[PDB]
Subunit: 368 residues, 3 copies
């Protein structure tokens, strides 16, 4: 309602759902508002699959970066001439190019998996589909749409054998249950096939007693990220803590909440509908799985009720600067010239400058 920047579950539709897991696909941002039209090629998926199961083979006509949000997983990318599976624990990023086959298995015996992917449609600005080689309960094989003669010619065989072996609809859809022994071989064995990145790998950018913010960037370091102009981020906010009023200089963040709960403040600037320019606040209640859009140069503050884990997909990331409006470091206001503050602000300069030296910590403080 009030908030076009906040998307919870009811905005999440369900493409596929059985007792072994489910796959949610978030609606095209360019509907609710043109406030972020420039995000329209970025569609969000969230996946959840029970222990010892598997998301079946397919590919999309959409670029993809994939990230382990809860639990444990063994993912496989596949090529025309190459396969290459990896095991990914949480806060691990993997990139599945377009047209490349891939499947995900929940390595874990007792605990779950809750994978979150961004998708990037190639053909149609807002749209991507899946292509399954295998038919099943919930979808159809893309080889069924071929001819009797071609299939036979292609595969060197009669229609009956191809059909009986490959085409027939068997499984209860796109996520099926797996043996324990079968798993030991899929794991056993764990190009444009990039290696999996760890989003927490180095020393975190922002860090103190109340919070942490890891961030991988479009760099000479990571060649892939540089190619997409896209940064990946992870924020962790302690219970009772406050991520202070801040913003991103230029990146447009699609944030999605891993776990926990907390308190969103987003502040926009609104032409109605010498025209009055309005500072309208927007707030929202954050819960496991929620999503909030965080446009460029727009201030936000976030307070954690619970131990709060956030994931952040950044667009237009190159040379981004997360600027802060309070604290010792990354304080942008502090940097303003002293006569600059004196004239702008109601108070004197030295007084206004004194209130800035008042808050002596940096990025995260105690909420209250």
């Amino acid at each position: 309602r009030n908030n076009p920047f906040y998307f919870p579950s009811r905005r999440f539709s369900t493409r596929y759902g059985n007792q072994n897991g489910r796959i949610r696909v978030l609606q095209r941002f360019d509907q609710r508002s043109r406030q972020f039209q420039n995000l329209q090629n970025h569609r969000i998926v969230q996946i959840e699959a029970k222990p010892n199961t598997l998301v079946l083979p397919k590919h999309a006509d959409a670029d993809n970066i994939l990230v382990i949000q809860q639990g444990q997983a063994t993912v496989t990318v596949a090529n025309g001439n190459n396969r290459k599976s990896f095991n990914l624990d949480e806060g691990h990023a993997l990139r599945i190019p377009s047209g490349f086959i891939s499947y995900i298995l929940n390595r874990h015996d007792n605990q779950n998996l809750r994978v979150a992917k961004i998708s990037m449609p190639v053909n149609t600005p807002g749209q991507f589909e899946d292509f399954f080689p295998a038919s099943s309960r919930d979808q159809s094989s893309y080889l069924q749409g071929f001819s009797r003669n071609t299939l036979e010619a292609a595969f060197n065989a009669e229609f009956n054998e191809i059909r009986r072996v490959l085409l027939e609809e068997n499984n209860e859809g796109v996520i099926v249950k797996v043996s324990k022994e079968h798993v030991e071989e899929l794991t056993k064995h764990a190009g444009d096939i990039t290696n999996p990145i760890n989003l927490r790998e180095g020393e975190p950018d922002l860090s103190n007693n109340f919070g942490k913010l890891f961030e991988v960037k479009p760099d000479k370091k990571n060649p892939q990220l540089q190619d997409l102009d896209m940064m990946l981020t992870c924020v962790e906010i302690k219970e009772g803590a406050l991520m202070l009023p801040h913003f991103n200089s230029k990146a447009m963040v699609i944030v999605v909440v891993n776990k926990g709960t907390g308190n969103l403040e987003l502040v926009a600037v609104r032409k109605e509908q010498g025209s009055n320019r309005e500072v309208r606040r927007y707030t929202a209640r954050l819960k496991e799985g929620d999503v909030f859009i965080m446009p460029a140069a727009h201030p936000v503050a976030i307070n954690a009720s619970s131990e709060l884990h956030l994931l952040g997909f950044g667009i237009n990331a190159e040379n981004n600067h997360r600027i802060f409006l309070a604290g010792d470091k990354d304080n942008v206001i502090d940097q303003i010239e002293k006569q600059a503050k004196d004239l702008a602000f109601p108070g004197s300069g030295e007084q206004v400058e004194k209130l800035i030296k008042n808050q002596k910590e940096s990025h995260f403080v105690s909420a209250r």
Copy 2:
């Protein structure tokens, strides 16, 4: 009708047409469907001019790559400070930048020329116009839209002389007939003026008894192509042969048929209009001059009735992978893990894997 991916002649309008040749311009893809909205800046032209004739001088506000589809030709690019004509035989690519003057002459005495260009509009997303310095039967000179004073001032002369020499409407339009002797001097003499590429130059990517596929890529090799993110391709399919079910990982191909005829299978994935996802086939009859769009990650199979020559302009080409769904090499299904196939497909793993080792050739086989 049924097929939005298939464009034949009736989709081709005619911008210019006389007894010495004609120029066809294919309608904006973003009309029929938003299924390939992202192709809207790519407009197709096809040109046909008799022996010993010439397409007259002009430029467009549209980038351009040009390719000899049938016959023989001598093409001239021109600059503010430089001219540079080349002779191009078939399967030769030439790039005419934006704002650069150019004309084409049919070098050949008895045989024709059937040039195919892609155009890339600079100003308006879907639209480009021609600018002719000379007036004629079918169009007007862009200097006529200047003033009496300016022209005179610019050119150092009275209006009468400028008009009599340059402006007056003379020719039967934009393609005129040429002398034999005149030709010997235009040929005699055969910057941002790039040299002409040969699309068949090296050793072909795919090759056997039934087919060939040459392809030039956006590479450290070809600097221009790298700049456009655009690959050029040529496929040759023998009579009776089958280009197996395949697709492009990420590139969006605008294919155009040089010569011959054959059998198009295109397989899409269709949301109508937990929603049913439909494998809808699309087919089409291919004839000299036809065009079919070949979106990313979408399977196609093509069988040649006649000796079939195809041209392919690729978009989003960088690190493309043409993936194949049948054959020894570039077989993507083969690469799937063995337990992966067993669970997905109706058959067992070893059985499903046996049907793959059945077809022992690679990319092209005998259709029937």
Copy 3:
């Protein structure tokens, strides 16, 4: 009216206006016509502030390049960890990234400042807003849209003190008057903070007795410009002089008139609304502050009534070529093959070629 390419003052709305200056923002080009849809992310601002005043602190969610059009100025960019002010005299370009704080002061005692900026919206294709940390008569502080608790928590203080010092609405809006002494310290002290470029720095590209054209390009030289694919230009046309019929091979120029007045000829190519292709002229009267769009491959001629200063922001600038249709140098017509002219033009080749050697100067001549 008649001209969609010509935008004068009445097209310029007023975002902010007091006795100490004013800020004009030109309407989104994608309204009047889709003739330049591809310019829709480029919005024009023009600023005018009296001697000894200041445009107050803010940032936008829009990239920005800024240029001194008349007078003298001291500009400050600011960061989360860095400030860096420069003094800029006319024809000086400065780049203010997105999310970065900045303010402008009129250094001069008796003379004015008339700054012209291009803005580039990050979030919404055509739209950018300002974000002021300080509240005032004409706008509101973006910290007012925060909460009682957060502000207090963030800043380490009660609501009263924060409000009294920082939040309260004090000034007569966004441009205020400054002391003489205050100025001596702001000037006294005169990252992603780029140094200021001089657009007249080297030896001018085009130059003679009647005109000058300076131009900075997207180069290995200027790294920033290369990043934006954007060239900056300055043209100076003598009273009575003529900038000859010319055009840009590929760049789309947003031109804005610094000072003087003169005579615009723009020549388009018009499908109505084997279709008739029309050379329609467009003209316009140019006055201090006017703006005219100059699409790619489109001819223009400009004659100066008065000493005429033009500013030019180029889009799609990489490897642009300004091509000329008259004069010794950059004459594109001259470059056409001799048999090429003979057939195209009404006259013979040698005659048509003689009228080209007639005008012996290059780029600027005497209008009449």
